[PDB]
Design a protein around this nucleic acid. Structure first.
Length: 48
RNA sequence: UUUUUUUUUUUUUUUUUUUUUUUUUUUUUUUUUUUUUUUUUUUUUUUUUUUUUUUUUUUUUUUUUUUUUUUUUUUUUUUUUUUU
């Protein structure tokens, strides 16, 4: 809701909660995916 | 100026004491007797954008005064007399 009000995300492409639950289940089970997105977070955090 | 006083008269050898007499080996005790592993817990469950205001409105030259007028020479005293 916060990003929709900021107009950063177009709400037309909104995935259903059925798909989000399936993806979240995959994200929790697998550590390899988590490590990749954590690595992205650290690199993006570094400014410059 | 000066006028006194300003030698000396005692005492001053010595007489005691001053070796020594005790004690001074030893007699205990002196190994040891316990205990000495362990038994819990130890992931997580919230929140985390924003909503106001934010130019200015006055005043801000000057008006006075600002020369001077007195006084301003002088009039005393100023050797010495003792003692030593």
């Amino acid at each position: 809701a916060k990003y929709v009000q900021q107009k950063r995300v177009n709400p037309f492409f909104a995935l259903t909660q059925q798909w989000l639950t399936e993806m979240r289940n995959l994200l929790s089970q697998s550590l390899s995916v988590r490590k990749f997105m954590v690595e992205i977070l650290m690199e993006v955090k570094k400014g410059g």
